[PDB]
Amino acid sequence: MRLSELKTGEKGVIVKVLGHGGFRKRIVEMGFIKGKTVEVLLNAPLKDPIKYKIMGYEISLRRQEADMIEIISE
């Protein structure tokens, strides 16, 4: 499933960052690396961005960016 599908309080593990080269390197550089848990701190309906936590850091992504990250839910 895509990361944007997780609701507030849910967790998953990154399996793949999709998109083109520039987008991928941008997202991976924020800390979205394979095999680490991502926790949803706030996915508020219709509001942008979504607030995540991974590698111990708070990171916000636009919903359309989180649409492009494949995860497996915990």
Numbering used by the authors: 1 to 74
What do the paper's sentences say?
The ferrous iron transport (Feo) system is the primary prokaryotic Fe2+ import machinery, and two constituent proteins (FeoA and FeoB) are conserved across most bacterial species. The function of FeoA is unknown, but we do know that FeoA is an ≈8-kDa, cytoplasmic β-barrel protein comprising an Src homology 3 (SH3)–like fold, which is commonly involved in protein–protein interactions. Interestingly, in some pathogens such as Porphyromonas gingivalis (the causative agent of gingivitis) and Bacteroides fragilis (a commensal organism implicated in drug-resistant peritoneal infections), the feo operon is predicted to encode a single FeoAB fusion protein in which FeoA is naturally tethered to the soluble G-protein domain of FeoB. Herein, we provide the first biochemical and biophysical characterization of the soluble domain of the B. fragilis FeoAB fusion protein (BfNFeoAB).
